[PDB]
Write a protein that binds this ligand. Structure first.
Ligand SMILES: CC(=O)NCCc1c[nH]c2ccc(F)cc12
Ligand SMILES: CC(=O)NCCc1c[nH]c2ccc(F)cc12
Ligand SMILES: *[C@@H]1O[C@H](CO)[C@@H](O)[C@H](O)[C@H]1NC(C)=O
Length: 350
């Protein structure tokens, strides 16, 4: 089990001003550290955040968090469940800032909520350095869904923080799961429920959201929403990043207004979505993109079962490690399906 630690700097807070925190399991015979960012949508105005506080409060507050959590999937310490990194030091960082891990604003006389996702990551890293992270050789920043986009927004900031603090030997890398979205034309179009790009644009202003500096300089003021889309922010990053994304991701289809007898118009829409996603990954050398309709993530216990071209995700991640010690015989790292319909890969989740 991973044990809860609330942040010693209690000014770094969840939405309601309670302290943020992290869950930790140490592995004293290991110099590898895995820091995982939880997901769970976001909120972008007072009324929408007030609703989230009533029925999704664990994503806005630490008041009700449990003392322990069990590590699963890539966070498991059992080699049978986690062939990749079972002996690593494991860290799970709860998502309680509702800002896609981008915020840097405190609760004040003008702000009903605090949005501190970017500062939470920095404070966790700072406090772990006194608990053994100072001895690491690799820090893998991973995350799923909103946490996967959070990896893209924050991995280079962690690298810069460790360099400025005096630890240039720690190699910082990223693993972004299910956070690589397209700002595409929707299948049907039209408050909250009526487009993601406009909700993110309003969110950034509400949260005082921050994006990586090279991407910010490309798109400039007012246009920072572009950096929340993987295919636009990825080329600006310097740390190595491995991208995991279903070709027919369920969250992508939901915001495209698709809810699964499929007739011709919808058939062509779904096929075009898969081809566009595959196209965005052509110049991403470390990636895993199966032709499945799914919302499942890499902290699930059966994450080892899916394969692309006969290679599982734990294997591809192992080959990525070897590559960062020119392709490797029988040890591939770029794995993108080419078949054009959900479940054309027989290994897709049931
Ligand atoms: C599903 C969707 O709306 N995707 C387009 C907006 C977007 C970009 N990165 C995200 C991370 C989490 C999230 F909830 C949304 C986003
Ligand atoms: C997932 C998501 O937010 N897609 C919508 C992006 C969008 C906003 N305005 C548009 C106008 C034309 C177009 F092709 C796309 C757009
Ligand atoms: C706590 O964190 C905030 C936000 O990063 C920082 O400004 C402040 O200096 C920190 N306090 C201490 C005592 O380290």
């Amino acid at each position: 089990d991973l044990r809860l630690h609330l942040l010693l700097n209690t000014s770094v807070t969840c939405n309601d001003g309670s302290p943020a925190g992290y869950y930790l399991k140490e592995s004293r015979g290991s110099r590898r550290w895995l820091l995982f960012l939880e997901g769970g949508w976001y909120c972008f105005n007072r009324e929408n955040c007030d609703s989230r506080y009533d029925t999704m409060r664990r994503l806005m507050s630490s008041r009700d968090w449990p003392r322990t959590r069990t590590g699963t999937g890539i966070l498991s310490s059992q080699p049978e469940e986690n062939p990749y990194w079972w002996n690593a030091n494991m860290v799970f960082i709860p998502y309680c800032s509702s800002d896609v891990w981008s915020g840097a604003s405190s609760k004040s006389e003008k702000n009903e909520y605090a949005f501190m996702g970017a500062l939470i990551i920095q404070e966790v890293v700072r406090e772990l350095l006194g608990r053994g992270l100072s001895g690491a050789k690799v820090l893998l920043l991973a995350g799923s869904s909103a946490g996967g986009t959070g990896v893209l927004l924050n991995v280079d900031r962690v690298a810069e923080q460790l360099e400025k603090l005096g630890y240039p030997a720690i190699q910082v890398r990223g693993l972004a799961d299910s956070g690589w979205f397209l700002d595409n034309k929707q299948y049907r179009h039209t408050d909250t429920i009526t487009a993601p790009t406009e909700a993110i644009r309003r969110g950034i202003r509400y949260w005082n959201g921050v994006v990586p500096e090279r991407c910010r300089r490309q798109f400039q003021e007012g246009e920072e929403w572009n950096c929340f889309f993987g295919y636009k922010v990825y080329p600006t990053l310097r740390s190595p990043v491995f991208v995991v994304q279903w070709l027919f991701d369920e969250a992508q289809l939901t915001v495209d207004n698709v809810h699964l007898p499929v007739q011709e118009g919808l058939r062509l829409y779904i096929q075009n979505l898969g081809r566009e996603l595959r196209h965005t990954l052509k110049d991403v050398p470390a990636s895993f993109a199966p032709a499945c309709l799914s919302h499942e993530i890499i902290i699930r216990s059966h994450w080892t079962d899916v394969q692309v071209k006969g290679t599982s995700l734990p294997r591809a991640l192992h080959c990525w490690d070897r590559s960062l010690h020119t392709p490797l015989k029988g040890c591939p790292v770029h794995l993108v399906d080419s078949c054009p319909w959900p479940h054309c890969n027989p290994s897709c989740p049931t």
